């Protein structure tokens, strides 16, 4: 089972979960950043806190697209991580089987 302990059934791995929700794939972003005012942004944040993440996510996408400075800073921060070398290491004082699995 997963690390969270939820029972895992291999039958559902054959199809993506979102495959049965074809309506999502056809959605187009509504661009809430156009004509934005402080009251509207505060409303967006408040409604996002209550579980309406759609408007907040669209606003964040627009914000990252429309600002060159924030764009460059975020790109620098992410490319800093992208350039790091990585490796897989077994558990502490691991055995031969764990070493082979790693």
């Amino acid at each position: 089972v997963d690390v969270y302990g939820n029972p895992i059934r291999t039958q559902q791995l054959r199809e993506p979960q979102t495959s049965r929700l074809a309506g999502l794939a056809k959605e187009f972003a509504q661009h809430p950043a156009k004509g934005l005012t402080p009251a509207k942004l505060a409303r967006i944040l408040v409604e996002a806190e209550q579980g309406n993440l759609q408007a907040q996510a669209e606003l964040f996408m627009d914000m990252e697209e429309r600002d060159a400075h924030l764009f460059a800073e975020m790109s620098k921060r992410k490319r800093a991580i992208l350039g790091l070398d990585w490796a897989v290491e077994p558990p502490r004082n691991a055995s031969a089987a764990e070493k082979a699995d790693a």
Partner: protein, 137 residues
């Protein structure tokens, strides 16, 4: 109709209105309602000319000072020939001076019966007003 035939009578007696309103019979015998109606209409028209810039013209109620002014102007208009020195001409000029004072924002239009007249929305006008960042965000 800021004044009526009854108002003109009650202001200037009935005999004088009978004299100045009848042009066909000598001596006069009856008041001709058409001439009085037209004189009142002309007085109302002049008052409207003087008052359109500060109030709604189709007034739903008549201030009493407006009634006095209309009666005076109608009586002045009822004269076919009027001299500069005629006292009625002086009264008409006085009423015109009051009308000009009201128009020029020097005098106010008083109560009609118990409520104020309907000042027009001239001074009300201002731009929409942009004050974002001050809406408690």
């Amino acid at each position: 109709s800021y004044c009526t035939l009854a108002d003109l009578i009650e202001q200037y007696s009935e005999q004088k209105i009978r004299e100045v309103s009848d042009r066909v019979n000598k001596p006069a015998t009856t008041i001709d309602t058409v001439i009085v109606d037209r004189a009142i209409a002309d007085a109302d028209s002049e008052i409207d000319l003087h008052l359109h810039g500060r109030y709604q013209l189709p007034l739903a109620s008549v201030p009493t000072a407006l009634k006095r002014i209309a009666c005076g102007l109608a009586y002045a208009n009822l004269h076919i020939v009027l001299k500069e020195e005629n006292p009625v001409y002086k009264t008409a000029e006085h009423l015109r001076k009051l009308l000009s004072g009201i128009a020029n924002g020097k005098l106010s239009l008083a109560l009609d019966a118990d409520g104020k007249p309907a000042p027009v929305a001239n001074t009300v006008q201002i731009s929409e007003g942009r004050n974002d960042w001050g809406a408690d965000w």
